[PDB]
Design a protein around this nucleic acid. Structure first.
Lengths: 95, 123, 82, 80, 383, 162, 144
RNA sequence: AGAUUUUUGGAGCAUCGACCUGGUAUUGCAGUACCUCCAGGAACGGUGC
């Protein structure tokens, strides 16, 4: 109800996902690590309690060995990532 | 109706290669005890046989493909589109002429049903 | 909705988590992504491990197979109900 | 709010669901449930280092799907 | 076989039927863009079929020049005709009429009320050649090209409006180097733009337009298509200026200009041809690009609800009354009746009277319950 | 009555006694085999008993097929493009045929994965050195007419027709 | 407003949709809600007045043909052709006795009708589109 | 609908199936893992580390 929604908003604003609340406040890009060693850099448009994120204008980079591995990357306009494959989520990336 | 159509096509192919109106390959076959009821104009198949003979005569034209090759109809889609547009314009003009003829017939029927039929004068 | 019950009792092929494909008549399903495939056949691809060797797929028929939802990845339709 | 309700309100959209074991199925998603079960029709599936095959119908589960890719002509404000 | 007589007339009749179908398609009005695009694709397919039939009919003239000496001869004639008539004198026991000699090409080149598509074009679909975002030639999909440009540039400082402004240039300075990796994306963007231009107008001659573009690239673009008042003459491949026309003509056959560089006329000729094709597609389809930019600006300036609205566009009655009970009436040709009261009502009717009038019995009240003809004849003879 | 897709779609496709998918097509009397690609490579054995097929040809590309039953027919000639259509063929039942010449089994050696063969009740087996010629033609076949190959038979096949 | 409930001749209520009867007023309002009622609801002059008439003198010339009359008319400057019609002699202004013949009359808009009596029963056809002609270049009317 | 059994993630060696040669006893009625033993060769394949 309303009390459960207020408790969910308090847990999203003051809990572990509050950095994810930084993704929807100032629209800043976040760095999410996947299970297949694919780092996704981009802001989050929508989130939930199960860490399911909706990213807009994201860039997915990974290392693929053909020797030395190359940093082959791609750019997606809109994407959705489940919370089961999320390993580490960084609020402020380096570059 | 395939055998009669094949016989009509054979008669149209044999009559188109004649050098005269009555000196053909079908006028002499009528006196050779060969029954051909499609040569008489009283039958309904004579109107189709005349169209088949006209198509066989048009297939022997010098631009029909015997001594020349068509380039505008075979290697120009714009010429075919212009011909289709001219045919559509001719069909629209024929439909407008038919509508004008129907309007004139309706005006004549309105004028004939409104005239006085009691003013009789014998001179 | 009832999209899972629309393809019931048809010759469907479900992809496993290990890479195998089980083709059979999925007659019964549940909410936990379980499948009851009557006259099922599982095909698993073998690695060539060479330069000139080709890639083959060993197929074995088991009959009625009860596949759990923890190993099933995706199910596709292959053939109509006979 | 949960993200399953935003994914359940999607019909006749050409999306691309990338699975966990190197599989990616691109097709028109026709059905989505609360358990993230994606039922699509006339899709193309490409496995890990394999040829992309074409399937008339497919039904991917919720736990086997790793990521999703939506087209650019899809508003996220009205779906949430 | 009459290849010069029957086959040429059949090809001429097929060409006339195709021209009549094209005139009937062009005379009818259009209401939607997708239906007009489907009608244009069907007309292009019919024009291609008519061109193939005309090319197959134009090659049947080798033996005609040899057979015209025997066909036009007046000494011959009814002998071979009588031989062919004796060959056509087989068994006529196949009692079957075939009116599909000329009506079948007329019906194959027509459409139905439920689906406006021809019989050879029944398997054609507009969704297999154009995407939903393009709108069957209304707009152009540029999201994948913008994503490829953002992946090649390796920077997130380029939005869709900046990519549309960079793609709007035709002869200005490029945003990247000509010898960089942007040419591999530009060739794909030109190959997509050529398919988008060929899909937007299927009735236009694509081969003649490609030949004209190749002639303009060879005779004009390779000989200084951009004169000046280093600024006098510019080369697209070498990317260097020239003092006069004689110096450019002497340097056109030079050793670095032929194959002694990484952007010479030997290796970078396909990239220059793709850039010229992209410039021709941008100059020919600039209105479609402006409409796509206006649609992108309207989608970006709208809210979520406006974008979502734009993206969405009885046995008991039969058992109580005595029905469903089979009854045989031998008078009216052993007919069936599903009720005793229904049979009693149909006994004093027009059908039973017409059945009894064939036997010669008058319609009276004594033959009301009469069913068999042998009993009715005896009842008529007894009275 | 010719063979089409309606005869294959209405046929009974089930599991056989060898734990494989087989479609029964007995009692059809099809003079030619065509349009067999409607199975979408979902069968391993195809039965063609009681048929009037004069030549075994016109087979589409099927990689899932592993057994062919052409028993009780009138096959006089054999096709040459059979190895390119069935690469995983292992069992071939060509019993009760009209093979008379020894050259009819020369395309039959084109199948490299063939291990089972049945050419019994045929006039080609009545001639002398028929099994030796069949062993010398296709050495990959291990079972010919419900009988295993022999080392002395292989030596006699390699010695003859030198 | 129920169009099925009516009042009988005995002070009762009658439903014609389901053909049911009700004695009191409380049973008619309770009969609309039910299975049978829901099943029955689910199962169920200007051109004639503006014509100028000056009556000029016509010029008709008849000729006995064998296998046709020619009427010379002035220029009418209109597309309306003069129409010919065969009528009986029973209708007249003064109605003379012994009138038992037919008359073919041709009429136009600016001119008066010219009528010729035909003593024969059927020797020709008085149809307009069959055997009549009107040359507007010479303004000559013929009918055969 | 997020806490261990299903759905918000543990991501050269050993064994088995075959292939080919000889001796050996069982001739038997059942819905079955498997199915007599010994000797010789293999330049066959699958699984885990």
């Amino acid at each position: 109800p309303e009390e459960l929604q207020k408790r969910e908003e308090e847990e999203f604003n003051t809990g572990p996902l509050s950095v994810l609340t930084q993704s929807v406040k100032n629209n800043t890009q976040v760095l999410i690590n996947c299970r297949n060693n694919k780092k996704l850099l981009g802001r989050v448009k929508a989130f939930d309690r199960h860490c399911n994120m909706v990213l807009e204008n994201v860039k997915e980079m990974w290392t693929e060995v053909p020797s030395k591995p190359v940093n082959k990357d791609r750019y997606i306009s809109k994407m959705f990532l489940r919370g089961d494959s999320v390993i580490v989520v960084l609020r402020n990336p380096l570059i | 109706s395939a055998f009669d159509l094949d016989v009509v096509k054979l008669t149209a192919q044999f009559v188109a290669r004649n050098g005269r109106q009555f000196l053909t390959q079908l006028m002499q076959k009528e006196q050779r005890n060969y029954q051909f009821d499609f040569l008489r104009p009283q039958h309904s198949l004579f109107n189709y046989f005349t169209k088949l003979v006209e198509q066989y005569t048009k297939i022997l034209i010098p631009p029909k493909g015997l001594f020349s090759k068509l380039k505008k109809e075979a290697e120009n889609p714009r010429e075919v589109l212009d011909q289709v547009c001219y045919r559509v314009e001719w069909a629209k003009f024929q439909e407008r002429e038919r509508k004008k003829e129907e309007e004139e017939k309706e005006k004549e029927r309105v004028a004939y049903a409104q005239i006085d039929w009691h003013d009789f004068v014998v001179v | 909705s009832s999209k899972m019950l629309q393809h019931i009792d048809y010759r469907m092929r479900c992809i496993l988590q290990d890479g195998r494909i089980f083709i059979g008549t999925f007659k019964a399903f549940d909410k936990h992504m379980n499948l009851i495939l009557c006259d099922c056949d599982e095909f698993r691809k073998i690695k060539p491990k060479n330069s000139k060797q080709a890639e083959r797929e060993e197929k074995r028929v088991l009959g009625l197979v009860l596949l759990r939802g923890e190993n099933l990845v995706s199910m596709t339709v292959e053939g109509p109900p006979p | 709010m949960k993200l399953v309700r935003f994914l359940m309100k999607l019909s006749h959209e050409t999306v691309t669901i990338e699975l966990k074991n190197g599989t990616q199925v691109h097709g028109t998603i026709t059905g989505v449930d609360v358990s993230m079960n994606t039922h699509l029709k006339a899709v193309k599936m490409t496995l890990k280092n394999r040829e992309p095959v074409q399937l008339e119908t497919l039904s991917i589960r919720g736990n086997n799907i790793r990521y999703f890719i939506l087209p650019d002509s899809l508003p996220l404000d009205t779906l949430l | 076989m009459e290849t010069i007589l029957e086959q040429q007339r059949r090809y001429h009749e097929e060409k006339e039927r195709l021209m009549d179908v094209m005139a009937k398609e062009m005379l009818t009005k259009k209401s939607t863009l997708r239906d007009q695009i489907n009608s244009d694709h069907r007309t292009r397919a019919m024009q291609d079929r008519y061109m193939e039939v005309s090319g197959n009919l134009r090659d049947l003239y080798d033996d005609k020049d040899g057979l015209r000496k025997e066909e036009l001869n007046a000494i011959s004639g009814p002998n071979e005709f009588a031989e062919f008539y004796n060959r056509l004198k087989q068994i006529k026991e196949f009692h079957r009429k075939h009116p599909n000699e000329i009506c079948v090409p007329m019906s194959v080149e027509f459409e139905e009320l439920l689906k406006a598509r021809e019989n050879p074009s029944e398997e054609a679909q507009n969704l297999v050649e154009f995407t939903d975002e393009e709108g069957y030639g209304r707009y152009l999909d540029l999201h994948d090209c913008y994503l490829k440009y953002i992946n090649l540039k390796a920077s997130e400082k380029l939005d869709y409006i900046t990519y549309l402004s960079i793609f709007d240039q035709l002869f200005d300075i490029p945003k990247e180097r000509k010898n960089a990796e942007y040419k591999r994306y530009l060739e794909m963007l030109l190959e997509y733009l050529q398919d988008y231009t060929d899909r937007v107008k299927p009735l236009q001659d694509q081969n003649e337009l490609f030949g004209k573009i190749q002639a303009e690239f060879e005779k004009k673009w390779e000989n200084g298509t951009f004169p000046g008042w280093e600024e006098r003459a510019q080369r697209l491949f070498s990317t260097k200026g020239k003092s006069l026309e004689s110096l450019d003509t002497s340097l056109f056959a030079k050793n670095p200009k032929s194959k002694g560089t990484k952007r010479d006329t030997e290796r970078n000729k396909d990239i220059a041809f793709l850039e010229a094709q992209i410039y021709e597609y941008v100059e020919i389809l600039g209105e479609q690009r402006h409409l796509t930019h206006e649609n992108v600006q309207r989608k970006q300036a709208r809210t979520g609800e406006e974008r979502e609205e734009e993206e969405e566009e009885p046995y008991w009655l039969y058992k109580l009354h005595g029905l469903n009970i089979n009854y045989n009436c031998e008078i009216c040709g052993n007919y069936t009746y599903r009720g005793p009261k229904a049979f009693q009502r149909h006994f004093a009717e027009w059908r039973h009277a017409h059945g009894m009038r064939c036997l010669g019995i008058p319609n009276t009240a004594h033959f009301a319950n009469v069913t068999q003809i042998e009993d009715a004849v005896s009842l008529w003879a007894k009275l | 009555v010719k063979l089409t897709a309606e005869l294959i779609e209405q046929a009974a496709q089930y599991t056989n006694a060898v734990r494989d998918r087989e479609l029964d097509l007995r009692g059809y009397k099809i003079p030619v085999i065509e349009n067999l690609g409607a199975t979408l490579d979902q069968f391993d054995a195809i039965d063609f008993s009681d048929n009037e097929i004069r030549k075994l040809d016109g087979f589409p590309l099927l990689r899932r097929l592993k057994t062919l039953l052409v028993n009780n027919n009138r096959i006089c000639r054999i096709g040459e493009g059979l190895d390119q259509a069935l690469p995983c063929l292992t069992e071939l039942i060509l019993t009760n045929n009209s093979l008379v010449e020894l050259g009819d089994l020369d395309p039959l050696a084109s199948l490299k994965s063939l291990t089972y063969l049945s050419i019994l009740r045929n006039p080609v087996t009545n001639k002398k050195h028929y099994r030796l010629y069949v062993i010398y033609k296709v050495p990959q076949v291990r079972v010919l007419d419900f009988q295993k190959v022999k080392l002395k038979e292989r030596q006699e096949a390699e010695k003859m027709f030198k | 407003k129920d169009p099925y409930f009516m009042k009988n001749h005995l002070g009762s209520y009658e439903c014609k949709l389901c053909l049911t009867l009700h004695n009191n007023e409380g049973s008619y309002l309770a009969h609309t809600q039910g299975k049978k009622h829901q099943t029955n609801l689910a199962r169920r002059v200007e051109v004639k007045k503006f014509v100028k008439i000056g009556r000029p003198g016509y010029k008709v010339t008849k000729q006995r043909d064998s296998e046709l009359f020619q009427i010379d008319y002035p220029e009418i400057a209109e597309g309306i052709m003069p129409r010919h019609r065969f009528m009986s002699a029973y209708e007249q202004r003064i109605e003379p006795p012994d009138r038992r013949w037919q008359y073919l009359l041709m009429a136009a808009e600016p001119y008066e009708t010219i009528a010729f009596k035909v003593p024969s029963r059927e020797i020709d056809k008085a149809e307009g589109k069959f055997w009549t002609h009107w040359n507007r270049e010479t303004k000559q009317f013929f009918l055969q």
